[PDB]
């Protein structure tokens, strides 16, 4: 039973969105991953968003670039938390993606993370933290993961 | 009269910007409808509006939005009428967010984007008229006459006194 | 027992952050609100973040502008979800605030919302949606609220 | 065949971008002409091209330019055909200069602006078709069919395997 | 006999362009000032540019904002030096004006000055410097003006 | 006797500034080219600017990137027209170069041209146009050059 | 004997630059304040920078806006640390000022602080910190000031 | 005994930060270099900043990119001067890094230098200049280095 849905408008977004999925796998959180396009499959996008809650999802992670409407339009159609990953665009380096996603109007939040792969990693982590607010074992796994990275960084600290 | 142009915007506060497009349509006697349709607050209604636009006899839609300005692009995803997007000047980023959100549409879903704010809104009305004028000679002729009068006005007021 | 902490670096951020608090009040979600500064009270900020989970908080909303470090540093110190509100800054209109908050490196997410008051409203709603993923009554409230706004916009 | 769309650009190096618009027109069987017309290097020729476009039977002009991208706007000042402006990605500023130079046209002279680069160029072709499709049903129907096929393609390739 | 033409697309540009004209007056350089619009009077603009040289002008100062095409299109139609003043626009504060003017392609220079009133002052000064490269008295007037400002600034220097 | 000085802060700017020099060569305008740095040779830069007029120069072309001060500081030290070429910088793609050059305060104009090689070409042409305002033969050359390019573009 | 020089190109920059001075006054660090313009008094600017060290200054704080060359050109002429305050410009809100100051090439550092009044305050504090690296009492005064602010923010 | 600490959040920043170190080596200023991450080792970062003064450091050079909090958070925890190097980030080319570092609020200065390698070089030179305010020999070494560069640029 998937707890997180990871969606993106194009197969070319996968290069970015795989990082989020890697985190969910590392933390043993069941998820689904789909191509859902705001612009090329708008009706399907509404159906996906609409039914997410009934289907058992708790969080949706959505990636898009350019005029990046997928996270916001999904967010308009569900009251699950929606995390938006700005995919790095070719001309404007994800500045268009970022502003298109983060600047949502009052009433329809999108939890926006960094442009590109760091954000995608962070979307996975943030989905986990959301689950971890009620699942202690996920919270504990997040703490352990962070503690291991801290130790790794600090003990390789000399240059 | 059957509307040829739909002028829509996500919020009543956008009207201060969008009224300029309507003024142009009025000046050129182009029948139109104006509605508040919000991508984010009335998403199902937005799809219904877009979906049915062609059946309803509309030829062009002008859509205004600011910030994460998704109204024009999502309407455009749902109709093959030409969709003209007016970036409303946002408070923090002065319509830069509005502009990039509207203009940077992916291959397959064009939005005809005009200038941020009131100049763009005027121009949305004129562009809707130009679209119509590609098959309505009288609208094309009116546009020419309008432009010619402005040219004369400017060139004959050309001394700075 | 507070479920949400709403924090900001300066009392001058309250004009922006009150909007998040108004949403929490509307939805009857218990919360606490504090001035916690990354730069002027850095130790206190660590202690706040560190103990949030023990204290029963589920989500933190943090507002900051300029070189806006509060949300990210709090997120570095807790695995509670942290929502960052970029406060509109004077010179650069919140662009500095936004980039300072959203561009967090892998490992330390901050859920970033829009620059200014719209973002603040949305931080309250997003905190609620986080709660609502497990509390059905909060979820149903969010759905009802949204449906009433849809009707109001469509009809009038 | 009588051209319905003129596709112009200031430099042969812009063709790498502009060819996408032409590809769309070809796919939809819309007759068109393509010319190098430079605002800055052939200014008189640009005016002549714009001026005569309507007489010559064109209904829409697609114009690409980068940097200080004046071609679309100056063509638009000289015709009341709809003019679609494609911002070509510039070397230093990645088409930000191109975009602002094109989209920020003053009241009176709209330019239908699309995305920077190749996505915009594709979209210029589609938008020219949508303009035509407002009075040519078959072009409108083709656009619908095209969009419907893409929708099916995307939704049925929707699992990431 | 005017030596400099000062042109702008709109009467609302005058608030900016008057600074250039004030300098020309201060330096006793004869000039003309006209509204010439790239977008609303395109043919007139070409005629103005075309005939400038025959008419005895040596430099044109052109102001425009937004999608600011007047300086560049004038420059495409004459080989007089053309100085472009980016007028501060409402939404983007003259960033559009600046890029529209300065980013000319190889073959058609526009001498671009600062956004707004400082640039307009500077357009007047730059037109004078261009004349001053061959008229010694104008060069000497520029030196004297600059020397007086230097003395003024330095001697009011304590705060 | 040089009529134009073409200067730049670093030898790495030559890749950009050679384009201006190519135009001057094409038009047979005598010029000198030098490395003159606002930041590494500030005194020399003042001396260069100061003496330009005595030395018979009529126009200076100056290229610089990043915090691009060369054109403005030279312009502060001469009433010759100074043309500033923003060199494309690594991180910010000449945006810093452009703003550093064009945004001169009242009193000290710099004639700014496009970022990079197009601007450099244009600095040469603009220097020539300045000369051509009084030398008819240079003006006529510029007209002929432009007419040949028009024909080439329109026909082929 | 002044330890810090606070300079700016225009009297209109004083509104911004006073904040730095207020900090120096608060900490009892002797300073001088002068209008020194890179573009309108270039020779004077070189003389000021050149003689700073001989005159007993340890740090220079320089404010400028737009094409903001003052800090960098002073820094090219002294090896005292130079702190640059980007003054908020009218059109571009200090983005020009910031890029013009901070993007200095290898060899000529400028210590750049925030756009506007916050930056100016911080230029004063940074000058003090530099002095405080060798003057214990200045360092201790900085710690006390920061501690008092911490307490004020955390408690009220 | 190290006089300067050079720190960065990630080993991948070393490519940039080495330039600062090379300058310190050239000038024979003892320094230490460490990975200290604001977001991945926040407690360690506080301990490093807190103890810097007791440990004998006079200046800290800190590099960070993206949401670049390291310099500012270290600066919140010490009254040593802290120099911030904006590391060039992938998407936004260090614009995020720059705004995240330079826009510090009143009370907590960071001395910000250019984006990337030029900035890093300059952080080393600026640290030296700070020391050179009280160490004549460092000051003199800075003058000699600058004079040699001047000669090299002017002559060849």
Contact D93 F94 (CB under 8 A): yes
Per the annotation, does A97 bind a ligand? no
Q: In the PDB record, what is the listed experimental method?
A: X-ray
Residue spans of beta strands (DSSP E) within C14-127: 31-35, 59-64, 82-86, 111-112
F113 touches chain E (CB under 8 A): yes
Return d(Cα E80, Cα E63) in angstroms, integer: 16
Question: Residues G21, G26, G30, CA angle at the centre, nearest 5°?
Answer: 60
Residue of chain H nearest G140, judged by CA positions:
H79
Q: How far is CA E78 from CA A32, B42, E97, F2, F126, in A?
A: 63, 54, 21, 26, 12
F43 touches chain G (CB under 8 A): yes
The alpha-carbon radius of gyration of chain B (Å, integer) is: 16
Summarize the annotated binding site of B as residue ranges.
11, 14, 41
Distance of residue G56 Cα from the nearest chain H Cα, in angstroms: 10
Return d(Cα A110, Cα A49) in angstroms, integer: 13
Four-point Cα dihedral F63, F64, F70, F74, nearest 10:
10
Q: Give D69-86 as a DSSP string.
A: --HHHHHHHH--S-EEEE
Return d(Cα A72, Cα A13) in angstroms, integer: 17
Q: Give the residue among F130, F96, F92, F95 at the shortest CA–CA distance from F111.
A: F130
Q: Which residues contact H43 (CB under 8 A, 6 or more apart)?
A: A150, C46
Residue H136 CB neighbour total at 10 angstroms: 9
- Joined together, the tokens standing for residue E143 give 């030196």
D105 touches chain B (CB under 8 A): yes
Residues from chain H that touch C100, judged by Cβ atoms under 8 A, are 67, 69, 96, 99-100, 103
Per the annotation, does G154 bind a ligand? no
Q: How far is CA C123 from CA C31, F49, F82, in A?
A: 13, 57, 52
- Residue H6 is given by DSSP the state E
Of C115, C149, C154, the CB nearest to B92: C115
- H38, H45 contact by CB (below 8 A): yes
The structure was resolved to a resolution in Å of 2.0
Return d(Cα A128, Cα A113) in angstroms, integer: 14
- Joined together, the tokens standing for residue B97 give 């967010």
Interface of C with B in 80-99 (CB under 8 A): 88, 93-95
Q: Which residue matches tokens 């570095």?
A: C76
Contact A39 B108 (CB under 8 A): yes
Find which of G117, G153, G155, G156 to mutate to test the C interface (most C CBs within 10 Å of its CB): G153
E strand or H helix at C5, and its extent? strand C4-8
φ, ψ for residue F27, nearest 5 deg: -90, 5
Return d(Cα D32, Cα D129) in angstroms, integer: 11
Distance of residue C78 Cα from the nearest chain B Cα, in angstroms: 30
- Residue F135 is given by DSSP the state -
Residues from chain A that touch C102, judged by Cβ atoms under 8 A, are 98, 102, 112-115, 119
E108 touches chain F (CB under 8 A): yes
Q: How far is CA B135 from CA B76, B101, B115, C143, D113, in A?
A: 22, 31, 25, 47, 21
**Domains identified in chain H and CATH numbers:** 1-156 (3.40.50.1970)
Residue of chain E nearest G66, judged by CA positions:
E114
Strands A31-35 and H82-86: unpaired
Q: Give the residue among G106, G100, G104, G107 at the shortest CA–CA distance from G86.
A: G100
Return d(Cα G150, Cα G155) in angstroms, integer: 8
Q: Give the residue among A133, A70, A134 at the shortest CA–CA distance from A101.
A: A70
Strands A31-35 and E111-112: unpaired
Tell me what percent of chain F is helix, strand and coil, each rounded to the nearest 5. 50, 15, 35
Residue spans of beta strands (DSSP E) within A43-135: 59-64, 82-86, 111-112
Return d(Cα D92, Cα D85) in angstroms, integer: 20
Q: Give the residue among H57, B55, H46, A28 at the shortest CA–CA distance from C50.
A: H46
Q: Which residues contact B131 (CB under 8 A, 6 or more apart)?
A: B59, B60, B82, D82, D131, D134
Residue of chain C nearest H95, judged by CA positions:
C99
- Inter-helix orientation angle B137-156/E42-51, to 10°: 40
Return d(Cα H67, Cα C51) in angstroms, integer: 24
Q: Which residue matches tokens 């305008």?
A: F29
Give A148: exposed, middle or buried? Use CB within 10 Å, 0-12, 13-18, 19+.
Answer: exposed
Of C80, C114, C132, the CB nearest to A103: C114
Return d(Cα C15, Cα C36) in angstroms, integer: 15
Please report how many Cα atoms fall inside a 13 Å half-sphere around the Cα of residue H91, on the Cβ side.
Answer: 27
Kindly tell me whether chain F and chain D come into contact, counting contact as 3+ Cβ pairs under 8 Å. Answer: yes
Residue C37 CB neighbour total at 10 angstroms: 25
B105 touches chain A (CB under 8 A): yes
3-state secondary structure of D135: coil
Q: Give chain G as a DSSP string.
A: --SEEEEESSGGGHHHHHHHHHHHHHTT--EEEEE--TTTSHHHHHHHHHHTTTTT--EEEEEE-SS--HHHHHHHH--S-EEEEEPPPTTTTTHHHHHHHH-PPTT---EE--SSHHHHHHHHHHHHHHHHTT-HHHHHHHHHHHHHHHHHHHH-
Residue E150 CB neighbour total at 10 angstroms: 18
Return d(Cα A108, Cα B15) in angstroms, integer: 21
- E35, B157 contact by CB (below 8 A): yes
Residue of chain H nearest F93, judged by CA positions:
H93
Query: Which chains touch C (3+ CB pairs under 8 A)?
Result: A, B, G, H
Residues from chain H that touch C66, judged by Cβ atoms under 8 A, are 103-105
Contact A150 H41 (CB under 8 A): yes
- E62, E102 contact by CB (below 8 A): no
Tell me what percent of chain A is helix, strand and coil, each rounded to the nearest 5. 50, 15, 35
F114 touches chain D (CB under 8 A): yes
Tell me what percent of chain E is helix, strand and coil, each rounded to the nearest 5. 50, 15, 35
- Joined together, the tokens standing for residue E100 give 């529209």
């Amino acid at each position: 039973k998937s707890l997180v849905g990871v969606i993106m408008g194009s197969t070319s977004d996968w290069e970015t969105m795989k990082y989020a999925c890697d985190i969910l796998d590392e933390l043993n959180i069941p998820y689904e991953k789909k191509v859902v396009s705001a612009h090329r499959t708008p009706d399907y996008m509404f159906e996906y968003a609409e039914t997410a809650r009934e289907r058992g999802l708790k969080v949706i992670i959505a990636g898009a670039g350019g005029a990046a409407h997928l996270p916001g339009m999904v967010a308009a159609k569900t009251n699950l938390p929606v995390i938006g990953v700005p995919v790095q665009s070719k001309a404007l380096n994800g500045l268009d993606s970022l502003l298109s996603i983060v600047q949502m109007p009052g009433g329809v939040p999108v939890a926006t993370v960094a442009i590109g792969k760091a954000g995608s990693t962070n979307a996975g982590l943030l989905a986990a933290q959301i689950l971890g607010s009620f699942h202690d074992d996920i919270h504990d796994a997040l703490e352990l993961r962070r503690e291991a990275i801290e130790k790794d960084v600090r003990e390789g600290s000399e240059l």
